[PDB]
Design an enzyme around this catalytic site. Structure first.
Site, PDB file in Angstrom:
ATOM      1  N   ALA A 224      -2.651   8.655  14.335  1.00 12.16           N
ATOM      2  CA  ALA A 224      -1.888   7.419  14.324  1.00 12.16           C
ATOM      3  C   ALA A 224      -0.468   7.491  13.791  1.00 12.16           C
ATOM      4  O   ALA A 224      -0.139   8.276  12.904  1.00 12.16           O
ATOM      5  CB  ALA A 224      -2.657   6.363  13.550  1.00 12.16           C
TER       6      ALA A 224
ATOM      7  N   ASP B  67     -11.957   6.885   0.558  1.00 16.27           N
ATOM      8  CA  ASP B  67     -10.648   7.514   0.430  1.00 16.27           C
ATOM      9  C   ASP B  67      -9.681   6.579  -0.287  1.00 16.27           C
ATOM     10  O   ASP B  67      -8.609   6.303   0.246  1.00 16.27           O
ATOM     11  CB  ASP B  67     -10.097   8.012   1.785  1.00 16.27           C
ATOM     12  CG  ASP B  67      -8.807   8.838   1.693  1.00 16.27           C
ATOM     13  OD1 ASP B  67      -8.544   9.414   0.603  1.00 16.27           O
ATOM     14  OD2 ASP B  67      -8.051   8.891   2.710  1.00 16.27           O
TER      15      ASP B  67
ATOM     16  N   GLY C 171       4.804   4.677   8.745  1.00 12.57           N
ATOM     17  CA  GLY C 171       4.236   5.935   8.315  1.00 12.57           C
ATOM     18  C   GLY C 171       3.387   6.609   9.363  1.00 12.57           C
ATOM     19  O   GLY C 171       2.992   5.994  10.349  1.00 12.57           O
TER      20      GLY C 171
HETATM   21  C1  LIG Z   1      -1.450   0.434   9.862  1.00  9.93           C
HETATM   22  C2  LIG Z   1      -1.899   1.471   9.189  1.00  9.93           C
HETATM   23  C3  LIG Z   1      -2.355   1.352   7.753  1.00  9.93           C
HETATM   24  N1  LIG Z   1      -1.408   0.492   7.040  1.00  9.93           N
HETATM   25  C4  LIG Z   1      -1.673  -0.787   6.692  1.00  9.93           C
HETATM   26  O1  LIG Z   1      -2.715  -1.378   6.910  1.00  9.93           O
HETATM   27  C5  LIG Z   1      -0.450  -1.316   6.056  1.00  9.93           C
HETATM   28  C6  LIG Z   1      -0.034  -2.572   5.582  1.00  9.93           C
HETATM   29  N2  LIG Z   1       1.215  -2.694   5.140  1.00  9.93           N
HETATM   30  C7  LIG Z   1       2.062  -1.660   5.137  1.00  9.93           C
HETATM   31  N3  LIG Z   1       3.332  -1.845   4.631  1.00  9.93           N
HETATM   32  C8  LIG Z   1       4.372  -0.895   4.587  1.00  9.93           C
HETATM   33  C9  LIG Z   1       5.671  -1.374   4.754  1.00  9.93           C
HETATM   34  C10 LIG Z   1       6.747  -0.505   4.686  1.00  9.93           C
HETATM   35  C11 LIG Z   1       6.548   0.858   4.421  1.00  9.93           C
HETATM   36  N4  LIG Z   1       7.639   1.767   4.395  1.00  9.93           N
HETATM   37  C12 LIG Z   1       8.980   1.280   4.817  1.00  9.93           C
HETATM   38  C13 LIG Z   1       9.718   2.486   5.424  1.00  9.93           C
HETATM   39  N5  LIG Z   1       9.783   3.600   4.436  1.00  9.93           N
HETATM   40  C14 LIG Z   1      10.536   4.740   4.995  1.00  9.93           C
HETATM   41  C15 LIG Z   1       8.481   4.028   3.843  1.00  9.93           C
HETATM   42  C16 LIG Z   1       7.648   2.824   3.348  1.00  9.93           C
HETATM   43  C17 LIG Z   1       5.241   1.332   4.234  1.00  9.93           C
HETATM   44  C18 LIG Z   1       4.163   0.457   4.286  1.00  9.93           C
HETATM   45  N6  LIG Z   1       1.720  -0.467   5.603  1.00  9.93           N
HETATM   46  C19 LIG Z   1       0.503  -0.256   6.099  1.00  9.93           C
HETATM   47  N7  LIG Z   1      -0.113   0.851   6.633  1.00  9.93           N
HETATM   48  C20 LIG Z   1       0.465   2.119   6.682  1.00  9.93           C
HETATM   49  C21 LIG Z   1       1.808   2.258   7.038  1.00  9.93           C
HETATM   50  C22 LIG Z   1       2.379   3.521   7.057  1.00  9.93           C
HETATM   51  C23 LIG Z   1       1.577   4.608   6.709  1.00  9.93           C
HETATM   52  C24 LIG Z   1       0.250   4.415   6.324  1.00  9.93           C
HETATM   53  C25 LIG Z   1      -0.630   5.607   5.948  1.00  9.93           C
HETATM   54  C26 LIG Z   1       0.149   6.760   5.301  1.00  9.93           C
HETATM   55  C27 LIG Z   1      -1.780   5.212   5.006  1.00  9.93           C
HETATM   56  O2  LIG Z   1      -1.178   6.128   7.147  1.00  9.93           O
HETATM   57  N8  LIG Z   1      -0.254   3.185   6.340  1.00  9.93           N
END
Ligand SMILES: C=CCn1c(=O)c2cnc(Nc3ccc(N4CCN(C)CC4)cc3)nc2n1-c1cccc(C(C)(C)O)n1
Ligand SMILES: [Zn+2]
EC number: 2.7.11.21
Length: 292
Positions: free
Chosen positions: A27, A138, A22
């Site tokens: 970032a 948030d 994401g």
């Molecule tokens: C590293 C940045 C913050 N963050 C975390 O700490 C975190 C932990 N786990 C995850 N897991 C995760 C795994 C897969 C997916 N995606 C798979 C691909 N899809 C197209 C969309 C959903 C999605 C999540 N994802 C995580 N984060 C994350 C990853 C993407 C976007 C965002 C936001 C939108 C909050 O900035 N946060």
């Protein structure tokens, strides 16, 4: 341009850049994996080119220093951070089941025990944060991540803040929270009660399938948060609706503390599953005693 491989010179570690997850703020998030241990993590890669102003650089530091001091079952694990000429890399626990926002997208309104299940873990994590004098500020569906067992892990500590003294009122929230509390909007100062408000909003969205103050104009959504303008659908339980009413009050001194929440009738008098079936991602669970 983001490097295909990332290397930390203090801890001697190589993480191979993988799937784009994401995009948040400056970032970009990618799933990264350690060359040696073969362990996969979530990687937050921020460009320095967008961190030239010291105010924006200090925010990143504050975010890291807060996140690294956090160790809890319902908080996204922190494994490290490192930097290079053009980027800042943060190494965090990877939750393969994404976030509650994805669940909300596909499932909309959830079953009452499902909401009771997640809200318990959102509260447990937030209880840990408030015990350590941290205000997330948030809390939303999109930063409440789910690991493989569907246990909640709070993440995205960008708008987080440490409370340095007793009765401190934070005058500035530089950034725009999703479930923005009335005291933030009215600029009257704020404290821990902003997180209980976000939890109240999250509770509404999980039970009803839409946010409590969603309008076309975000500025008119803000007018509603100020006027306390919301209505709970009458198909929602009068015990669950009474907890939403407690958490969504314009007066922060009237919202239940993060410690009093688990002791509300909504939790104490209702079925809270020990675990959720992975089918619940797609199909609403019935929670039946035995299978015919
Ligand atoms: C590293 C940045 C913050 N963050 C975390 O700490 C975190 C932990 N786990 C995850 N897991 C995760 C795994 C897969 C997916 N995606 C798979 C691909 N899809 C197209 C969309 C959903 C999605 C999540 N994802 C995580 N984060 C994350 C990853 C993407 C976007 C965002 C936001 C939108 C909050 O900035 N946060
Ligand atoms: Zn600012």
């Amino acid at each position: 341009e983001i490097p295909e491989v990332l290397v930390d010179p203090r801890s001697r570690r190589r993480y191979v850049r993988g799937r784009f997850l994401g995009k948040g703020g400056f970032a970009k998030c990618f799933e990264i994996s350690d060359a040696d241990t073969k362990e996969v993590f979530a990687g937050k890669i921020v460009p320095k080119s967008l961190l030239l102003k010291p105010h924006q650089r200090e925010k990143m530091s504050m975010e890291i220093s807060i996140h690294r001091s956090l160790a809890h079952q319902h908080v996204v694990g922190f494994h490290g951070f490192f930097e290079d000429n053009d980027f800042v890399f943060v190494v965090l626990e990877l939750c393969r089941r994404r976030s509650l926002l994805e669940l909300h997208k596909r499932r909309k309104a959830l079953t009452e025990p499902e909401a009771r299940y997640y809200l318990r873990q959102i509260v447990l994590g937030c209880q840990y944060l408030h015990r350590n004098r941290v205000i997330h500020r948030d809390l939303k569906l999109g930063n409440l991540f789910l690991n493989e067992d569907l246990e909640v892990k709070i993440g995205d500590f960008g708008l987080a803040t440490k409370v340095e003294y007793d009765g401190e009122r934070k005058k500035v929230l530089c950034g725009t929270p999703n479930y923005i509390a009335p005291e933030v909007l009215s600029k009257k100062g704020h404290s821990f009660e902003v997180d209980v408000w976000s939890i109240g909003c999250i509770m509404y969205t999980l039970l009803v399938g839409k946010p409590p103050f969603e309008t076309s104009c975000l500025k008119e959504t803000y007018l509603r948060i100020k006027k306390n303008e919301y209505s709970i659908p009458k198909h929602i339980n009068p015990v669950a609706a009474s907890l939403i009413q407690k958490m969504l009050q314009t007066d922060p001194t009237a919202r239940p503390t993060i410690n009093e929440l688990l002791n509300d009738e909504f939790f104490t008098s209702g079925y809270i599953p020990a675990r959720l079936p992975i089918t619940c991602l797609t199909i609403p669970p019935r929670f039946s005693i035995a299978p015919s």
